[PDB]
Amino acid sequence: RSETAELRAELVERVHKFGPVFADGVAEGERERRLPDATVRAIDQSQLAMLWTAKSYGGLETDVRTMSEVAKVLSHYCPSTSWVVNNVNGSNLLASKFPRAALDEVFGDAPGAKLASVFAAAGTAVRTPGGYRLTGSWPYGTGILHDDWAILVAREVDADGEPVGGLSMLVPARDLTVEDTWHTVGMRATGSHTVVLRDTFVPEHRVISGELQRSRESATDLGLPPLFRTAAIAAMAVVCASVVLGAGQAARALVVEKAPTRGIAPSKYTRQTDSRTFVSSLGRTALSIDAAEMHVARAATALDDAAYDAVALPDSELLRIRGDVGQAVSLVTTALDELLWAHGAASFAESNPLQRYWRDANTAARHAMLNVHVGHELYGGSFFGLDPIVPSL
Amino acid sequence: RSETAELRAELVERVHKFGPVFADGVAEGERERRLPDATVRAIDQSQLAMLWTAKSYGGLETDVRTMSEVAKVLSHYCPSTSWVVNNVNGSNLLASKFPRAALDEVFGDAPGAKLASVFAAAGTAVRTPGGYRLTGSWPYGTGILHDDWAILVAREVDADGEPVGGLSMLVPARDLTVEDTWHTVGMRATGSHTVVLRDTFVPEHRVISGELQRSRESATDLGLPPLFRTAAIAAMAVVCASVVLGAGQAARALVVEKAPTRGIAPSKYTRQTDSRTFVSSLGRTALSIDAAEMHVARAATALDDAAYDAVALPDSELLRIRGDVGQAVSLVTTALDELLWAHGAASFAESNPLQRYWRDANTAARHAMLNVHVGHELYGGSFFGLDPIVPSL
Amino acid sequence: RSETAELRAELVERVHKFGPVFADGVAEGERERRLPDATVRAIDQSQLAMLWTAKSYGGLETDVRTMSEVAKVLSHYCPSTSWVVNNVNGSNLLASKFPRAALDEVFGDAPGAKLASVFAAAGTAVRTPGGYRLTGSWPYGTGILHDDWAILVAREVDADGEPVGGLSMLVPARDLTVEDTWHTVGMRATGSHTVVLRDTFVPEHRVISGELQRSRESATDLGLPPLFRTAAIAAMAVVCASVVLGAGQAARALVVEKAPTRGIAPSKYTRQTDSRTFVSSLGRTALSIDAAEMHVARAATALDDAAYDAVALPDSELLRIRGDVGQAVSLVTTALDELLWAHGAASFAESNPLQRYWRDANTAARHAMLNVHVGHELYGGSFFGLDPIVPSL
Amino acid sequence: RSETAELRAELVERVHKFGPVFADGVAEGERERRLPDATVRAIDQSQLAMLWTAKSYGGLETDVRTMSEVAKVLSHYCPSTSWVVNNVNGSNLLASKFPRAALDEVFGDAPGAKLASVFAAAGTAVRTPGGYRLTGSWPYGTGILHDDWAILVAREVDADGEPVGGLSMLVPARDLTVEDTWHTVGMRATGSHTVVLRDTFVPEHRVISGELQRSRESATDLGLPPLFRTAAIAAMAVVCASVVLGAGQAARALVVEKAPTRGIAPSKYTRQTDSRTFVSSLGRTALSIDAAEMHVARAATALDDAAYDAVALPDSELLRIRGDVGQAVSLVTTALDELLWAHGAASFAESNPLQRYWRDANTAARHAMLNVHVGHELYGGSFFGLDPIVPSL
Ligand SMILES: c1ccc2[nH]ccc2c1
Ligand SMILES: c1ccc2[nH]ccc2c1
Numbered sequence A, B, C, D: 001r002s003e004t005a006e007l008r009a010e011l012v013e014r015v016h017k018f019g020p021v022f023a024d025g026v027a028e029g030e031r032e033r034r035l036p037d038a039t040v041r042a043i044d045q046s047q048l049a050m051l052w053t054a055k056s057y058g059g060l061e062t063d064v065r066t067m068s069e070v071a072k073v074l075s076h077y078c079p080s081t082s083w084v085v086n087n088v089n090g091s092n093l094l095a096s097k098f099p100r101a102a103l104d105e106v107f108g109d110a111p112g113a114k115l116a117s118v119f120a121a122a123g124t125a126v127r128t129p130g131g132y133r134l135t136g137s138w139p140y141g142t143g144i145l146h147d148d149w150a151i152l153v154a155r156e157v158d159a160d161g162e163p164v165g166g167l168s169m170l171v172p173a174r175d176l177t178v179e180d181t182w183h184t185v186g187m188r189a190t191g192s193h194t195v196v197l198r199d200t201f202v203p204e205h206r207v208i209s210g211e212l213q214r215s216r217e218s219a220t221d222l223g224l225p226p227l228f229r230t231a232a233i234a235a236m237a238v239v240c241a242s243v244v245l246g247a248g249q250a251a252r253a254l255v256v257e258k259a260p261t262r263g264i265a266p267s268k269y270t271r272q273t274d275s276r277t278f279v280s281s282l283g284r285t286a287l288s289i290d291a292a293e294m295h296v297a298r299a300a301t302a303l304d305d306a307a308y309d310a311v312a313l314p315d316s317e318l319l320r321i322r323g324d325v326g327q328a329v330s331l332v333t334t335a336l337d338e339l340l341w342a343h344g345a346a347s348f349a350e351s352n353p354l355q356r357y358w359r360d361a362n363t364a365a366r367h368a369m370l371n372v373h374v375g376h377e378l379y380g381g382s383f384f385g386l387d388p389i390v391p392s393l
């Protein structure tokens, strides 16, 4: 275990090393709505997309905590990069549910392979000899422009067209065609465009049931390494929350950094630190962000402990983790509003990084897996053993 | 009084009549960072910049409540337009502190005259024969590109250069030169650029002491009409809050309008109205916005009552009004965050008006006169008769 | 109308006149869990139980606003008295749904008649010749010990025992028997004991359908005076909220009164007013209480306007009023927690009135008609025209 | 270290073993305002007052985390007992700053010795031959009736009467005289009465400077065991917060336990679990309590890590811990208000444990060391290196 703490220290140190490159390409990504080439280069050199890739394929093969800690530091430099990087690892982790044939095809000669994934069942597939024929239109395809493969969920149907089952299908970039639909006010460089397919062929070995994609049966398998025992869907939500969290932490640091050089208009306080109302308010806001940090870590640690222990997390724990992530990001978005008040009107200038953290965090926070209202109802429901209101845990 | 309620109904009806024009020019203003010509035309035709202009100059000469109600409806169509319109009236109201010579020069042949004003003392003036010589750089000059005059606050100095007093100075557009400094993520079309002057001459009749600009001695003057008895600085803050409020109300209406046609991902709720967690949350959020509405109205009514009654508002009332406006906008920005949660990820699309209300309201809310933390300390301080932490009330 | 504002001023002045008597009997009522005789005397002398009694029976016959304003001032002296007084008027207002025979029997020779009422259907009634035979056990019978009659809701059944309909039944104190069940930590003097009946006879003229008790058909009846056109159930909730509100306002006044004579342990602030963190926080807390005040008044005014105008309030307005009252009391209970923080450890001493307001307001706030969560779901539901989750409006 | 986790499991198991006795004496303690004899017996048998007593004196000598975890479970049975128990250990820990002579006198033949302590400098002491002469009146003396000694802070003065320095003085029960001043609405059995002294003699060996009482110089001393390297004042605040936290957790468990057997009046929801508005709200409230739990643990772990590592905590860390404890208890008191709303009117019945947790937690939370507003200003101030607003850290 002392190894995994040491590795984290190195990967966090890499983010600081490569950070300047990510920070350098912020303006272009905002402008173009995709990651600059220098950034993608840096992501590939740094191996930050390989944290949840297996060691057998030359990956780093870390744990949930390490990915989270890396995510939070990355968001300081560029929230979009942090979001793409984390979604790639999460997508790479989900690919471990596919057969060895698929995994070998994807990672065999590509240690730094990068996957996209959209779980919304936006397509229909039919049985054809040797595999499936897939058609659909999948929005919110994060980082699809730079990814090698994509995991797409679809609804299987028969010759007549009646639904028979859910599928999770791994298709390469060569078969992909991407529509430009990502025009947003935050997380712009994420390039979460729509993936389109039209009668695209997918072989048997690169298709699993959606029922098997959600599986946590690997939790008790001693043959697998700890990482692949982890509850992947929960783990993905945790690291996504870390991206949002990290942006909020950067917003706090900035407001602290600039407070002694600014006043509170139109008050007598020429310095923001001179106002004890400002200081206590900032102390309060900081403690909310600290709570969100403790929330994300609690969940990350629960997933890591169970993975190493090779025990299956009960539904109640998974339901609680979904509440933790929703609560954490909800605290951050409220904290950001409080930080804009603390800073003042200059925060909304395009030259100011504060509005950038504000916009990126707020946009990313409304990801399905981070829904605070759904999270509350899930966690609240676990106390009475009610039916989960979401299909996947 | 039944007249002033009838007039409001007509002016609100005008906003709806001209609204389509304002709504039509939203995309261009966002792009260009200034109001389209059709909008400025509509503002001049509608007389919405003449609400706080005197009847003797062919103005409408209404009251605080009416301006507020017009402001809130305007924000539905374009928050930037609402902000410019309201700042013009407020600036026009502040001009009534100047001598008749200035007022005649400004409004004599221009019933629809539009003033800018920045109160931050960003310039220095010296005595010269017949007037003053003024130099400075004044940021945040709202709607300056379309305005005829500008009220600029400056610090008077002597031949040696030692501060002697504060001044409020009315200078025309012909003497103005505007720097392009307004690059923001919200309230973009407001064109709050920097006003620059360099050894510009201002005559005696268009200069008053800053000490007289803040004056509320007109409160008891029965010679003046009610409007000009009103506490102008307080009244300006109230209508500014109305702009922010109105945006929040439009955000609420939109979320209500779209809820039955959307789901809550990734939950079983295919319709947002099917979730009672969604409905109660929306009910709660709506009640916060309702409180902000009641806050702004309370203040508006206090100012109007005293103006018609010809009584001077004590400091405690003015201090309370400053708390009301800060509280109202603080509730709206928090409510907007809650509405983004209610709506979901689609809210951050550029095609969606929700992120537009969100950004515009949040940017405008950090106006000095709307500072929530300062407002709290002011109102709290009035309970114990502490010294106000702001110079103007 | 200038009369009803003048009358309010007098009735508020009466509360101050008789206030010392109510304040004098606080300690005894706390001890004995019922109102002292001096208090009941004062209630009868002051006519504060006759505000919603008809003028034809020698009552004051005021409006919702006046009752609310009286309620808020009463809570300063003794919250329990305020609660009893307001419940009596509300119960007296509900009696106007009964036939003239009942009203004459109740108010004919008793202008200062005081009714109790519990709406929870805790009893069953059967048809007998000339009336009904009633049996049941009704908890939460506020002020029953001092009341002359009681309005009890029951479920009608047949000889076999199958439910047939809902009833509202007016029975006198002579037929009542009261069980001592009111052992609480707040609102102790309210004496909300359980009313018990056993095969008690109730004649036809003192029984109406529960369906007619909830009726708002009197809203458009020009024959009735304005008061009896008012939506009684909504009006009762509003004045109940006023009792809770008034306690919160008294808590605020006390904290303001004592702040300059106390410190903030263990800080350097020997005076609470010396801490600007304390002052701004108090300013914030005060603004929440101000919002609750504006909420209650908004609702009161909506009910009064419609009553005088003789128009029926649509469900949406009534649903909104239920949200207003729940929001108002929710703000007050949160504000009280904030005021305890402001004051400090001395607040929880039995000698300190602050913990008394705290306990009384918190207990009363959980009245069914003041349920904040139900209120939110009701008001939220009105936006989409959903079925109300409560039977009565 | 695996020992200290094992010991905790046993001490938590002891609280459950002896819990029934504490729970049994709740009604009497509430009535009499002091701990029943069976409780004091149980405290002495269980060794729960000996957690922060040295092993050399036959104590358990645990750490901050263990005391905290024991505190939280104790509050389930009786919050007052938990508060007394924790204050005794904290007082016993502070006694380690005194010389060996004092420690031997106190703990030499009394392994289960129980100390009181009040830090408010409410007394004056003068130099006399062989020691000091002490006079004063010290309020809030928790558990003084059952304690063997008391640590009292005083101001040293000269023959003339001018202040010279601060003192911390250890005096036995034989020299104590206790005034009955503890009449409160929560934490009643704590018996926090006033300690009075009149020209009482205190020898040199049982007196240290207040300057040495606050000392953290023991942090780096490898001669001392880890427990006595811990920052005692910070550690005391942490365990006090644990008492409040534990009460809030018990309130949550109760509301969860009773929800399926209760309805939400006056709604259609016959069961509380049937309302998804109730469930999500409870989920939200639970997450606030979870945050407070994570706050207290974070602080406890920071103190324990530094103690075992033998490093001195910088001021910034100590300032942060003071923010954590204030935030945690602030979350709990707000959470309790939310839980009363969830439960309903039955919560305020004297027979219901919910109002007991509510009152006890709220009273205890206003302890100086748990002041949320002071905590915010302290933690906020650490970001800019401002002077601490409290004398002790
Ligand atoms: C939930 C679970 C897994 C996922 N992979 C990509 C998106 C996404 C959402
Ligand atoms: C405060 C008072 C008046 C003002 N006029 C323009 C800005 C502004 C701010």
Ligand SMILES: c1ccc2[nH]ccc2c1
Residues within 6 Å of the ligand: C090, C091, C094, C117, C118, C119, C233, C236, C369
């Ligand atoms: C709701 C409506 C009317 C009522 N009368 C007494 C209680 C009560 C509750």
Ligand SMILES: c1ccc2[nH]ccc2c1
Residues within 6 Å of the ligand: D090, D091, D094, D117, D118, D119, D233, D236, D369
């Ligand atoms: C702060 C620090 C230490 C203490 N001991 C007893 C009370 C108390 C408060």
